[PDB]
Amino acid sequence: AGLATRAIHSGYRPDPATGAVNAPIYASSTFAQDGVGGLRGGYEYARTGNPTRTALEAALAAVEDAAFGRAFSSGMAAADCALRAMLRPGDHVVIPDDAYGGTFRLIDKVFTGWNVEYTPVALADLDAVRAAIRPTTRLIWVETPTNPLLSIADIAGIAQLGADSSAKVLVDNTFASPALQQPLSLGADVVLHSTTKYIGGHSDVVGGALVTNDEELDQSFAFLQNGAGAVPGPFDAYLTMRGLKTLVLRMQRHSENAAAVAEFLAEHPAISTVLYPGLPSHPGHAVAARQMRGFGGMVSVRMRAGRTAAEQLCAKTNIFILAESLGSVESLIEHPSAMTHASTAGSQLEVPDDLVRLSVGIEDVADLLDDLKQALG
Amino acid sequence: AGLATRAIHSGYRPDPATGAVNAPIYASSTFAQDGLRGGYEYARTGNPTRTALEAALAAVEDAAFGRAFSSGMAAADCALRAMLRPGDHVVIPDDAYGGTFRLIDKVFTGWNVEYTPVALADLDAVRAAIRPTTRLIWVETPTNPLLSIADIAGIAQLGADSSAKVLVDNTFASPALQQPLSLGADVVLHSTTKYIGGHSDVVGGALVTNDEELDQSFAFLQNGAGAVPGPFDAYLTMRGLKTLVLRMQRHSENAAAVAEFLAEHPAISTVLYPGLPSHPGHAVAARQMRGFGGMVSVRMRAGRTAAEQLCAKTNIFILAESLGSVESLIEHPSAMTGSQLEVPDDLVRLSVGIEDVADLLDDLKQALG
Amino acid sequence: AGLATRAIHSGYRPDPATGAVNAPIYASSTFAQDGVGGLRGGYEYARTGNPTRTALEAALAAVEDAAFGRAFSSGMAAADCALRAMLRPGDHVVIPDDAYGGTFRLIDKVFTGWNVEYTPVALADLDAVRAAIRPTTRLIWVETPTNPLLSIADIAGIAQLGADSSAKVLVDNTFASPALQQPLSLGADVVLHSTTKYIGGHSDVVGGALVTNDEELDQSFAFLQNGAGAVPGPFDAYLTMRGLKTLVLRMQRHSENAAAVAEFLAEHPAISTVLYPGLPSHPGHAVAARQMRGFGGMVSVRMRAGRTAAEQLCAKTNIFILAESLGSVESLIEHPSAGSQLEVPDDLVRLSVGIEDVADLLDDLKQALG
Amino acid sequence: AGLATRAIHSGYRPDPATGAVNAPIYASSTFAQDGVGGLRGGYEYARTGNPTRTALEAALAAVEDAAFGRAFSSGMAAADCALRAMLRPGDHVVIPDDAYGGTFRLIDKVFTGWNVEYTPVALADLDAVRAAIRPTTRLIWVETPTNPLLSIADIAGIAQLGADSSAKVLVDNTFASPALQQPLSLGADVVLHSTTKYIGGHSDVVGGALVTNDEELDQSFAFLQNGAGAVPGPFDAYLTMRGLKTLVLRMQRHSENAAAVAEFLAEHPAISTVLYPGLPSHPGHAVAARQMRGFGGMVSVRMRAGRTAAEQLCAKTNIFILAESLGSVESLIEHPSAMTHASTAGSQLEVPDDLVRLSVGIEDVADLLDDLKQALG
Ligand code: NA
């Protein structure tokens, strides 16, 4: 019934033959048959399906209260699958104006070359979202909170816009995780995750997922999962599943630690602006409160003294690790403007060069606050 | 210098810090910075275990560049998307691997890519299939499951003449038996799931090239679409590769013995094996392959039912999909299938493993009756 | 500084060459040298030492505030090492009268055959512990709380007895974990863990550990770690480290869930007695409150209707899994009964309370009890 | 029936539920039961037994034509288990005078402290072996060929001496491997392997094994495997099984390559002596030919110019890697007198300081000979 329970129990039952309590790691590419096309348990070739991946898919679906789940080699592979399943040449996608850089790069640098068009919009403005919808729009791509500004989109509101124009709605739920936000309950057709981030939780397995309740959509995804073959290995699928068992517990601590870090930085003279969905003054706070169970582990801040101060903070932390990625037990810090591609100018919001992004981990909060205090001098 | 040596030694050098003789499994998605350490920033983009695997793959094909992927089909998908756009055309085999045909015909046609299937053995027919829009010729040799042979150097010349790239799917032969880049191909593809890994335990793919711009086009899609291998799997793939030369030699010896046994057996009408002088394309095979491989396909005298029953009755050959394993595998391909040749329903495909040959021949003799 | 912080950060620092944030899995049995004996990083042969095991040993030591750590293939292999390092033929060990059955088996069925003698004692009675000490006693083996009765031993008090008689004191800290109890700070010479249980946390890696501040004792352990070779593989050592990263967080929720389960069962008429260190009426509660930061995830109960009711409860739960072992995220349940040691009552059920939603756990027990 | 076939097929049968062709990696420490004691497949707790270890144990036993197999965390843990199973205080073991250094160190430095005694003997001299047997001798420890000197022992002859005096006979078959030598067929009671070496074959898993036909001895080993817990992880057990699949093929090439290296070195003026069981002049060559199917991958040589020449050869090779261990696909080289412990003096033969040990791998032979030629100057 509860999400912590499902994350542990759903989608692998102890094996009948051995009782093994955990899904085994099936490092087999192929599966013996009886008589010919007499499949055992439906298994025939690992890319097509294998038992470890099935277990992960069932756990993933369960924690989003979805009927169907599909696992991929990365978040980007899941995104690529979703785009290729739902779009064809001549179709259009509405996307966020501050999307995840990787998603933006895949759509702008790859899919435009295959005659897909897009329009970026401020997803917080429902009138703008609707206005960006054309007769060719087949998909609205929602991410909330966004990476790195933590902007908020009203999922139920956007889902209505999609229903009214026969466009599917996909929510990239990576930052919130299943633990904090359930987009299918709010009207989304499909949820995407990079399981590399909070679901795995340990910065040790790259992976993606798509979940849906629409059986025909799940079939379209399966055709590309099999056909194009961006599929996870079984050791990685096991590590993803293992991480997922502690997601609920970890997200609670992440949120608590992040709230403390946001309050500390909000009081600190080196900081001009704190971006955290739980702050009453954060734009979209009331939307976040309505659709999220907690406000997450991500905090971004803008430095009063500019790009140099941002770079200095990133350089001087000793517990926050200066590295890309997010959603790990270990705190991570980065300066996102350093990752700017020239090409995004005009099509995506400029990430301010005074901004630092903090992925607040589950270390003792006093040590995290002390690290930031010393780093800031 | 020798290929067995390179498989073992090229690519990963024992580590400076520890001397570990094998490439470590870096189960890390991200890398602390100072600039980067070692050039690593985020594992999808690059990581040390995949770098090692890519360097070993490139070394065994005498290629400057290698890219590793989550499967053979992901490597194919990367190749098609890097080299084609809407409005372009690809010449393909008339008896291509079913997964490659399915991807091109069921997915890429929907993105305004066109194709023409051709008997690759007929160079005049290959040339005639080339249009002004043809940007790629897709070569597989020997083909899966009919073991037909394509003249790589002759097709390479056709590509050069019409400014079309030539890709060779070298899965069946492997780098130990065939080196398409030395024959003019622009890119080589492998399903490393098969002979490179060798043990039916890791799904993986690879693209290797000498063309730096083309490797960059591949990298853009490896990173951007993210069909990338995990580090335990890249380790297993590398591990397998260390015995490829030695395994392919025994595969080939065992296959030859199987082909001769089955040639002499009355239950069998036709034997398809590149090493038989009567096999169509044998002379081409002999010129471009160091050995004739581990795969043998046969046609049963008594038809489909005799094919089905042979597959059911072996006790050492395992009835399963896939190929290129230490363990012998057997399948009835027609049960897995105007745009491609019809695989005869009396055909059985044997992936002959490295078991003792006398046990394999005994297993076939009892199963055939 | 804080324990959750050290669990994540002490031990492995991101690699200088690559910055990898996690300790790599070094699946190498050997290491290239620069000239004969020019070692790289000290590494020469995996059984003797390897980078993934080093990383795990540093993490394990850090979380016990210990100078030295050693990792083994299982908890029992750590135990075997400790016994072999600290005893010889003719020596004696004082042991708990309700020790972990594996430990008792190893000592009674193997080490007695090698002319080591033992005396079982109620560790809660310090006079009895002291009286059990002979001139040949070299080791006092403490476990607290015990498996499965959750009896408590005063570590500091036994430490004093060990000091007074030149006997070393080992504490098996598996049930409490480093997150709840720090025996080296109370005077123990050595701490043992089965990392199979809470430290790994996910019922997916078998492993053991010894930690100490005594460099000489660590050397004696190292000699047998290398020489008898009961050493973990690197995938397993990585899984153990990964688990450790969430230990503090998990033990908090284990303790909360367990307290709720104990209260529920204490109120239920099918239950005669509840064994949980956190109950004020539990024998040894005050000692537990002094030496433990929290009361753990284990609960044992005695059934009013006896052995058959204990069997039935174990069979009828759908969230608690009927299986051996303990200290996993997933709740586990078992019927332990199924002159040298206390007899475990055949009406007793042992619950390893996991981290699932507490309302689901209480509902599972309610339905199973009928 | 043939050994290559058994190595691939014996032990693990493709799974009934899924048909997986390979033994799955069961990363579970525990197994669900049906009602209390209703075990599934006999599994209860992983240290006691687990499906991946079972599969390995079955494969190991099959390749030695043995009824019983037991897998350990290392060769040394297998040795420890054998000694503890078969000896008690007051008992005695006859050992080689030139044993593997690890085996000797365990017996001399650990077991002597537990009141076990030993006598080292030239195993090639059956009279001497017999004379070393006392009323308290419970075990004769045979290693052939020995590490590093490649001396040969007559297994059948020594088995007879053990039968005559009711002492068990153990053969450490690590260097020959099951592909080249089958000691149970020659009368041994137990065979030990470090599977770290040729069976794994890839210098990537540490492991050990004991195999026997005596059910009571296998029970005594199980008691200590379970009780003292020196047991392999499932990943490592899987890698050991994977390596075993190619053992027969590898050992053939190792033997071919080694013979070529021994011939090259025998003709080279910098080399005084070549130690290889296949040379007709090697002491014990006729015994080796009688009991071994091939002469193995190890070659040791003595350098005419002494210790410094031995050190130089080891430092100057670029294909042979200067590292410990042996039995890998990659060639390895070492100077064993640097690895020996001084306190063996008087109880073991001295390994001459002019000796180089070569573990000849499966690289191309021409490259291996070129490497030795350049390194020797
Ligand atoms: Na795989």
Numbering used by the authors:
A (entry chain D), D (entry chain A): 12 to 388
B (entry chain C): 12 to 45, 49 to 351, 357 to 388
C (entry chain B): 12 to 349, 357 to 388
Paper text:
CGS is a transferase and acts in the committed step (the fifth overall) of the biosynthesis of l-methionine. MetB is covalently linked to the cofactor pyridoxal phosphate (PLP), similar to other members of the aspartate aminotransferase (AAT-I) superfamily of enzymes. Similar to other CGS enzymes, MetB forms a homotetramer, with each individual homodimer creating two active sites. Here, we present two structures of the cystathionine γ-synthase MetB from M. ulcerans covalently linked to PLP and bound to the buffer molecule HEPES.
A second structure contains PLP as well as a highly ordered HEPES molecule in the active site acting as a pseudo-ligand. HEPES is bound in the active site with the sulfate head group pointing in towards the pocket and only 3.1 Å from the ∊-­amino group of the PLP–Lys208 moiety. The HEPES molecule is bound by a series of hydrogen bonds from the homodimer, including residues Tyr111, Asn158, Ser336, Arg368 and the PLP–Lys208 moiety of one monomer and Thr59 of the second monomer. HEPES is only found ordered in domain A; however, all the other monomers contain a well ordered sulfate at this location, suggesting that there may be a poorly ordered HEPES bound in each case. The presence of bound HEPES in the active site of MetB does not change the protein conformation locally or globally (the superposition r.m.s.d.s for MetB–PLP and MetB–PLP–HEPES were 0.134 Å for molecule A, 0.136 Å for molecule B, 0.151 Å for molecule C, 0.141 Å for molecule D and 0.15 Å overall calculated on all common Cα atoms). The only noted change is seen in a loop consisting of residues 350–362, in which the disordered loop in the MetB–PLP structure becomes partially ordered in the MetB–PLP–HEPES structure. There is no apparent conformational change observed for the PLP moiety in the presence or absence of HEPES. However, the MetB–PLP–HEPES structure suggests that the active site is likely to be blocked to binding of these molecules owing to the presence of a well ordered HEPES molecule.
